[PDB]
């Protein structure tokens, strides 16, 4: 199954947004599942950022979102925002924690 990075790009997510950083982190084993985290920083207006969050939220797969941060990039009038978020997908763990 294609990863979250591909889902964003295959379905065309993030219109109007300027990606700054995409970092795929090492998988984290837990006793019931393996987490696949992706850290993303992206710049845009509130509307385009919201559309992106809704797009990820509407994917037909379990994605959890964490560590949401948003700050204006500059003190100017109505300027764009920098949004940081950690997204995770999951797969089963049938092998324990050895």
Residue numbers in the entry: 109 to 206
What did the article's authors report about this structure?
Although the soluble, stable complex was used for the crystallization experiments, the resulting crystals contained only a truncated form of PilO (PilOΔ109). Although the PilO construct used encompassed residues 52–208, we could model only residues 110–206. PilOΔ109 has two αββ motifs composed of α1-β1β2-β3 and α2-β4β5-β6. The four β-strands form an antiparallel β-sheet onto which the two α-helices pack. Previously, only one discontinuous β-strand was identified in the first αββ motif, but the new structure exhibits another β-strand break in the second αββ motif at the same position, resulting in a secondary structure pattern of α1-β1β2-β3 and α2-β4β5-β6. The main chain carbonyls of D175 and F176 do not participate in hydrogen bonding between the β4β5- and β6-strands in the PilOΔ109 structure, creating the discontinuous β-strand. In the new structure, a dimethyl-Lys residue (K196) was identified on the back face of the β6-strand, the result of the reductive methylation used to promote crystallization of the PilNΔ44/PilOΔ51/PilPΔ18 complex. The monomer orientation in the PilOΔ109 dimer places the β-sheets on the same side, forming a longer 8-stranded anti-parallel β-sheet. Instead, it is more likely that the previously observed PilOΔ68 dimer interface – in which both N- and C-termini are oriented in the same direction, towards the inner membrane – is the biologically relevant one, similar to the orientation described in a recent cryoelectron tomographic model of the T4aP system of M. xanthus. Only PilO R169D and I170A reduced twitching motility (approx. 40% and 50% relative to wild-type, respectively) and levels of surface piliation.
Type IV pili (T4P) are long, thin (5–8 nm diameter) hair-like appendages which extend from the bacterial surface and promote attachment, cell-cell aggregation, biofilm formation, and twitching motility. The T4aP system in P. aeruginosa is composed of four subcomplexes that together form a transenvelope machinery. PilMNOP are critical for function of the T4aP system. PilN and PilO also form heterodimers. They are predicted to have similar topologies, with short cytoplasmic N-termini preceding single transmembrane segments (TMS), followed by periplasmic segments consisting of a coiled-coiled domain linked to a core domain containing two ferredoxin-like αββ motifs.
